[PDB]
Amino acid sequence: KHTVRAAGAVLWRDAHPATVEVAVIHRPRYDDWSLPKGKLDQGETEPVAAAREIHEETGHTAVLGRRLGRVTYPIPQGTKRVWYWAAKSTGGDFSPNDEVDKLVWLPVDAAMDQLQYPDDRKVLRRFVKRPVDTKTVLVVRHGTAGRRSRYKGDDRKRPLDKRGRAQAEALVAQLMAFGATTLYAADRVRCHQTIEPLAQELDQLIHNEPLLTEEAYAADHKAARKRLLEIAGRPGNPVICTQGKVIPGLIEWWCERAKVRPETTGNRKGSTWVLSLSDGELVGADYLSPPDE
C-alpha cells in the first residue's frame, strides 16, 4: 500500500479562565509544540491508535468523541493520512520522557498560540467550532454475511462469514475507543453476531430490536427513526447494529434535521457511524470504514 495511516487527538479536560483546556505537547525529536499523534501499529484502526497515542504521549486515558478532520502529507511511497479526534481525559498523569518532555494544559486561544503548525491549528479550529462534551451513539452495519437467500427466514438467520467474523472481532477495540457501554441490534443473526465480541468484552447483553430491521422499515420508514432517538436518549453510549437499508436514511434524516455535515460517507458492511450528541442534538456524524478495509 502507498498510504501510511496515522491518528491524533485534541485531548481536553474540564478545568479556569477556561471551561475546557487542551493538552499541547513538546516533542524533543523535533523541538516542537504539537498534538498527540502517531502511525497505526499492526492490526489497529485509527480510533485505537488515537487512544493509544494519547496514553503514550500524555499519560492520560481518554474517551474519543467527535472526529476533527484529516491532514495529508506527501511521502516517498505516496501519502500519509492523519485522522484526528476530540478526546476527553478520563484519568492518568503526565510523566516526561524522551518522546514528550513537557505537556501544558491551556485554554483553546492560548493553545492556538502555542501550536507550531498550521495543520494542528486547523484541527484546534475544528475542535472549537462545536461542543466536545458529547454523548456518542455508534451505528454499525453488520459485517460481511455472504449473499442473500430467497427464503426470508433463512436470510434473516444468515450468519457472518469468515471475513465478517474477523470484522466483528476487530470492532471491539474500535468501539471501546468511544466508550461504548450498551448494545442493541436489529432482529437479525448477523447484526447480533457483529457486536457479540463486544458484548463478550463488556459483559453486556445485546438488546434485540425488531423495529430496526429492513422488514420494519418497509412498513414504517420512521418508527425506526423514533427508536434510534429513544435509544439515544438513554444514559450511556450505545452501539446499534443494523442493516444496510436502514442506515443511510436514518443518517441523512438526522443530518438534515440537525444541519450536520458528514465529512465522509459510506455504508460498508462492518462500518461505523459515530454520532455525537450535545444536549440531545446531533453535532457530528463520522463514518468509519470497516476495520479490515
Q: Is 31 annotated as a binding residue?
A: no
102 marked as part of a ligand binding site: no
All three cell numbers of 7, joined, read 491518528
- 217 annotated as belonging to a binding site for a ligand: no
CA distance 260 to 274: 13
Is position 30 annotated in a ligand binding site? yes
Q: Is 37 annotated as a binding residue?
A: yes
Cβ neighbours for 78, distance < 8 A, ≥ 6 positions apart:
1, 2, 3, 4
Handedness of CA 193, 199, 200, 205 (dihedral sign): negative
158 labeled binding residue = no
74 has binding-site annotation: no
The backbone torsions φ and ψ at residue 86, rounded to the nearest 5 degrees and listed phi first, read: -75, 140
Was 39 annotated as part of a binding site?
Answer: yes
Residue 28 annotated as part of some ligand binding site: yes
Whether residue 281 is annotated as binding a ligand: the answer is: no
Is 67 annotated as ligand-binding?
no
117 assigned binding-site residue: yes
Give the residue ranges of the annotated binding site for substrate.
Answer: 27-30, 32, 37-39, 73, 80, 99, 117
Give the residue ranges of the annotated binding site.
Answer: 27-30, 32, 37-39, 53, 57, 73, 80, 99, 117
Give the residue ranges of the annotated binding site for Mg(2+).
Answer: 37, 53, 57, 99
